[PDB]
Design a protein around this ligand. Structure first.
Ligand SMILES: Nc1ncnc2c1ncn2[C@@H]1O[C@H](COP(=O)(O)OP(=O)(O)O)[C@@H](O)[C@H]1O
Lengths: 106, 304, 69, 49, 100, 69
């Protein structure tokens, strides 16, 4: 939330533009904990922030953290589930869920 | 009261509140002035400021002895403060506090609707030890059997009372239409938008009642039978069992490729085997008390 | 951080100040403005008092008799 | 205070997660252990020339 | 008349309302310094604060705790709180803070 | 039998759930100095094998000094 509070500050308005708007929608996606919204914001702004001057490595750490933070919350009701429903609750494809879950047991 | 109150006159009184406290609070009239501004704060829809200036009141109590219609009737605006978010158990504690004066003021319509308003939503509080003994206090009343909602508090005792939500709907056609005075049921549930939040909450409280009794009396239960025993969909049943188990308030664990869920405790080797010795020790001890007793009755009658 | 400020009044206008402050007196500033809103019956700091709490604790020049500089 | 050189030179390798001790580790440790009184303002010195 | 009340709500409002001390968050308001003459002020307007609840009083002579090694004195702190734990805000009356 | 001793006369031992009242990340930005005190006290107490790996004989005492506050 303080990300928007900085860029609304009077010194940051001098240097406003595209890349500050890139981190705003990333802030809103991390605020809502919406997974594909982060993926959409990464996809919409390529040369801004999927390049890695020194931030896209750190964004991959925050995104790979956000998977199991969303994934641990949706296991507790069951002992046993089929994986197309857990792809439906996460609103994502199932193949990357398989490679992520297989990393979690290993 | 020149322009009969607005945002400005609420600001005009909040800036001049404590100047009397700065002169000398009057056991009564100072309390009567320092209460009056927060209903103006409710007119400006201010709630956090309202309870701060309401907490000054609490030490000046027991002046309703000399007060006929003012002391415990301003607190009907204090439940409007706690009307806001969820605090249902606290304003049923409140209704028992304002229960007394219309029994001093021996009325049979204002006091009867005090019984009506308190018996409606002790139910709507979430289940606790505080709800469990409060209903054990307010039951057994000599006055509660004037109203057919004595049946309802009996119906929410325990062990399901063989219930069904559609039968609860057919017990409650009267809450809008007829009754002796009927007015708090229209006030609580018959309202449009505040009733409808309480409509979904009363549906929420009865399905919460039905989960606990299923955990008492079932090893397993299928998915289709739980949905028809809760009068709603299978997916809305999945949502209700999800946010209760992550609330860790009902122990359950489902299996939704086949739909069979269970309410079993997590099995362990020694505790199951700790049970066989316990049944055994109770068995061997009881036959000793049995044989000791039949030896006596043999001994008495043989002598006659 | 462990204080509900909740305004749009920026604190860094007091970072960039001279009149170097000892670390114990920073603790005095944030607690004084806590008093200088609650005593006036505010459930939140409005940070118009924060100027006055800053100017209060900074005045430790005492007397010095206007003598020997 | 030769020990103080020996401890602080080996301390430089500890913060580097290293066991190797070079001659550069000692020469930085000489200036750390050895100090002075640092008599300031010089007016005391030149009152007493 | 000015000092009956200037001391009143600087004690009353923090003890009656600790919830505002989380609406911004500081626990800290620990009382005023009554200094001046001996007169009747030290003993009599302490009973003016006794007008609502108050009561407690007890007594602080400012001498039985001032023993030199403070390993005993810290126990002599909590010895007086053996009755101050028995209530709500107990009001430790304290005479001759600075007098030996 | 021998009773459990007490050694209980002049007790200043901040222990028995009474010591802390603070976490380690409460201090704002003494990062050269939070790292330095930790090397002499907290580090040889737990990871004593690192000093024996070199033969350091970890240091005994630390003198802090500065303005009051
Ligand atoms: N860098 C700092 N970070 C957080 N709090 C500080 C800092 N410096 C001072 N304080 C606060 O100021 C007070 C100074 O206390 P203390 O350390 O006893 O003073 P001194 O530095 O003279 O020993 C502490 O209670 C502390 O809460």
């Amino acid at each position: 939330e303080d990300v928007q509070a900085l860029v609304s500050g009077k010194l940051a308005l001098r240097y406003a533009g595209r890349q500050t708007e890139a981190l705003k929608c990333v802030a809103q996606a991390s605020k809502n904990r919406s997974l594909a919204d982060f993926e959409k914001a990464l996809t919409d702004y390529r040369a801004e922030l999927r390049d890695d001057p020194i931030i896209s490595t750190h964004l991959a750490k925050l995104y790979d953290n956000l998977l199991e933070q969303n994934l641990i919350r949706v296991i507790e009701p069951f002992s046993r589930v089929q994986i197309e429903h857990i792809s439906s609750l996460i609103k994502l494809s199932k193949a990357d869920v398989e490679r992520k879950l297989s990393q979690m047991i290993l | 009261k020149e322009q009969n109150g607005d945002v400005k006159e609420a600001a005009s009184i909040l800036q001049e509140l404590q100047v009397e406290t700065y002169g000398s609070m009057e056991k009564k009239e100072r309390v009567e002035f320092i209460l009056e501004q927060m209903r103006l704060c409710l007119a400006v829809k201010d709630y956090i400021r309202t309870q701060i200036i309401s907490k000054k009141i609490n030490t000046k109590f027991f002046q309703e002895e000399n007060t006929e219609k003012l002391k415990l009737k301003y607190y009907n605006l204090m439940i409007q403060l706690d009307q806001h978010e969820g605090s249902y158990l606290s304003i049923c504690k409140h209704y028992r506090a304002i229960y007394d004066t219309p029994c001093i003021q021996a009325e049979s319509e204002k006091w009867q609707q005090a019984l009506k308003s308190v018996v409606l939503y002790v139910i709507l509080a979430p289940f606790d030890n505080e709800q469990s003994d409060l209903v054990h206090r307010i039951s057994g009343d000599k006055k509660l059997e004037e109203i057919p909602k004595y049946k309802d508090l009996l119906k929410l005792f325990t062990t399901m009372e063989l219930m069904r939500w559609s039968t609860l709907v057919e017990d409650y056609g009267m809450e809008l239409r007829k009754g002796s005075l009927e007015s708090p049921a229209t006030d609580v549930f018959g309202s449009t938008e505040e009733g409808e939040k309480r409509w979904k909450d009363l549906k929420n409280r009865v399905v919460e009642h039905n989960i606990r009794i299923m955990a008492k009396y079932y090893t397993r239960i299928t998915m289709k039978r739980m949905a028809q025993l809760l009068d709603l969909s299978v997916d809305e049943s999945e949502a209700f069992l999800s946010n209760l188990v992550v609330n860790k308030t009902i122990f359950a664990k489902v299996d939704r490729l086949a739909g069979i869920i269970n309410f079993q405790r997590p099995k362990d080797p020694n505790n199951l085997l700790n049970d066989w010795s316990q049944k055994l020790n109770s068995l061997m001890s009881l036959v000793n008390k049995t044989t000791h007793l039949i030896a006596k009755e043999e001994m008495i009658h043989n002598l006659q | 951080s462990k204080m509900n400020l909740s305004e749009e009044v920026d604190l860094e206008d007091y970072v960039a100040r001279p009149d170097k402050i000892s670390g114990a007196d920073i603790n005095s500033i944030c607690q004084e403005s806590g008093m200088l809103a609650v005593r006036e019956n505010r459930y939140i700091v409005l940070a118009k008092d924060f100027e006055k709490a800053y100017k209060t604790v900074i005045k430790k020049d005492e007397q010095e008799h206007e003598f020997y500089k | 205070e030769v020990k103080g050189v020996c401890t602080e030179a080996g301390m430089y390798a500890l913060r580097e997660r290293r066991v190797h001790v070079t001659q550069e580790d000692f020469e930085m440790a000489v200036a750390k252990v050895m100090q002075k009184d640092s008599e300031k303002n010089m007016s005391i010195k030149k009152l007493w020339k | 008349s000015e000092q009956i009340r200037e001391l009143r709500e600087v004690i009353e409002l923090p003890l009656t309302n600790p919830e505002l001390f989380q609406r911004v968050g500081i626990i800290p308001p620990k009382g005023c310094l009554l200094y001046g003459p001996p007169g009747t002020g030290k003993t009599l307007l302490a009973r003016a604060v006794a007008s609502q609840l108050d009561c407690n009083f007890l007594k602080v002579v400012s001498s039985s705790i001032v023993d030199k090694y403070i390993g005993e004195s810290a126990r002599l702190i909590r010895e007086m709180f053996n009755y101050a734990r028995d209530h709500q805000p107990c009001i430790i009356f304290m005479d001759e803070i600075d007098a030996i | 039998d021998v009773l459990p001793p007490e050694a209980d006369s002049s007790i200043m031992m901040l222990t028995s759930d009474q010591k802390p009242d603070v976490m380690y990340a409460d201090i704002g930005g003494m990062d050269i100095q939070k790292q330095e005190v930790r090397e002499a006290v907290e580090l040889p107490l737990t990871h004593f094998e690192l000093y024996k790996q070199i033969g350091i004989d970890p240091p005994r005492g630390v003198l802090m000094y500065g303005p009051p506050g």
